[PDB]
């Protein structure tokens, strides 16, 4: 009864590896590194939509809420995923955005988002420090889909609530599996959700940053693909004004 | 378009 | 006292990601897929030498034994590593040799080593089935360095024996950590070493195959880089004649 | 050469 019920689906629908298409022969300029990150984002977003569609229960939400939750959570989802890829592939020494777009310190400085990169590297190192297992990683990630909503609620709020709880309960089955002592599960859950909450202020600093960059992007030779431009121009101001907020597991 | 992919 | 003693070093010296340099615009021919795998091998071998040098205790072996153990174990080491990369990056759906050289079923058929690929895919799926943690993976891998030697022994046999045991004992600290029940450690160790032993017959089928291919490689347009050619022409016949054999954890 | 890399 703490054998997982969505875990096999989570493994079968995990997206594969997406390349940025970055030409590594080129200078580490701000224009070149950001153009590739935005391109990598647009490509990842196609994967996130197809994954979210296949996620158990997601297609029960109102079609509009499907759209709102993908639009508000994509940043945290892709940040958390990259952290994990950074940890598995290079042991957190660098931000492994894609195999053809790996950020060392020099790229972190040239991207003009050095302190945000440092924060991502730290999140990446937690996977090592907390010994996050690959099963815990896939259930934690699905939780991040359900972790940011309008202050006023969605069309079918009570349904979103119910799905969120089912993902909290699945992460709990994955915890309780290889643990025998009654109290140990809630202690592991607490360390895991502290980790999920520290994704939220990173995703907020990256929202501010990409919004600020999109409205000046012509001035600095940074290319935003159309889907990304659209979601950021309309949706991100809602997150910046506090119309849309994260659901924290703990007071902050 | 987001909306076309969701479809 | 079951806090790991080489684990932090194992994390710090883990090699990063190595590309094959395969031109994916090209046909899945036997000549093109094998030329890239041999190229990927030569590149990986530079990483394996630098890793093995940095591994605690390895540089205490006679310099000649250093050479013999790298020369006999490289196949199992690179097979096991790929399995893990296949599991973390694509969930075992494909053999993730390098980011620019990923084998789907069609490449497995065109490489003329379809049954050996199936066996690697299976080993990859065990990382999922046995829920191998990333810490267990790095200590299991170091064990594979110490798992094939001449029947007659090496120059400093008793020293190799002592280092092997220290790596068995480190994998045991990583097991015993998050386990409270006395009997559970040896049961996990047993499942882990069964897994390490199933690397040995795969590495032997790939030794036969690459030896058979190297001596006809001019006939079939397959390029072997010089270091690889050298190790395979001289060393692999010693493994095929039974002068050099695996150390099995269990009777076979 | 293996040997040169080991050195
Ligand atoms: C989500 C992405 C792209 C995918 C990824 O691995 C994480 C990464 C985190 C920073 C994002 C980037 C997409 C493009 C953004 C939003 C840039 O405009 C600024 C910061 C970037
Ligand atoms: C070790 C390599 C190359 C590195 C790797 O990820 C595993 C893989 C397993 C099969 C090997 C290949 C190197 C070249 C070989 C030896 C070919 O000649 C035939 C099978 C290949
Ligand atoms: Cl416990
Ligand atoms: Cl236990
Ligand atoms: Zn419990
Ligand atoms: Zn024990």
Numbering used by the authors:
A (entry chain A), C (entry chain A): 668 to 919
B (entry chain G), D (entry chain G): 62 to 68
Show sentences the authors wrote:
Here we present the crystal structure of the human AR-LBD homodimer bound to its natural agonist, dihydrotestosterone (DHT) and provide in addition strong evidence for its crucial role in receptor functioning. A synthetic UBA3 peptide comprising this motif, S59TESLQFLLDTCKV72 (S59-V72), was found by surface plasmon resonance (SPR) to bind with high affinity to liganded AR-LBD (KD=30.6±0.7 nM). Crystals of AR-LBD grown in the presence of this peptide diffracted X-rays up to a resolution of 2.15 Å, which allowed solution and refinement of the structure of the complex. Electron densities in and around coactivator binding AF-2 grooves could be safely interpreted as corresponding to residues S62-T69 of the UBA3 peptide. These residues adopt an α-helical conformation with the side chains of Leu residues L63 and L67 inserted into the AF-2 pockets of the AR-LBD, similar to the structures documented before for other LxxLL peptide motifs. All AR-LBD structures deposited in the Protein Data Bank (PDB) to date belong to the same crystal form (orthorhombic space group P212121), and feature a monomer in the asymmetric unit (ASU)20212223 and Supplementary References. In contrast, the current AR-LBD crystal structure belongs to the monoclinic space group (C2) and presents four independent, helically arranged LBD molecules in the ASU (details of the final electron density map are shown in Fig. 1c,d). Two of these LBD monomers form a symmetrical ‘core dimer' upon burial of ≈1,000 Å2 of solvent-exposed surface from each molecule, while two peripheral AR-LBDs associate more loosely to the BF-3 grooves of each of these monomers. Core dimer: the two monomers in the AR-LBD core dimer are arranged ‘head-to-head' around a local pseudo twofold axis with both AF-2 pockets facing opposite directions and separated by over 60 Å. The protein–protein interface is centred on residues from helix H5 and the L5-S1 loops of both partners, with additional contributions made by residues from H1 and H7-H9, L1–3, and β-strand S1.
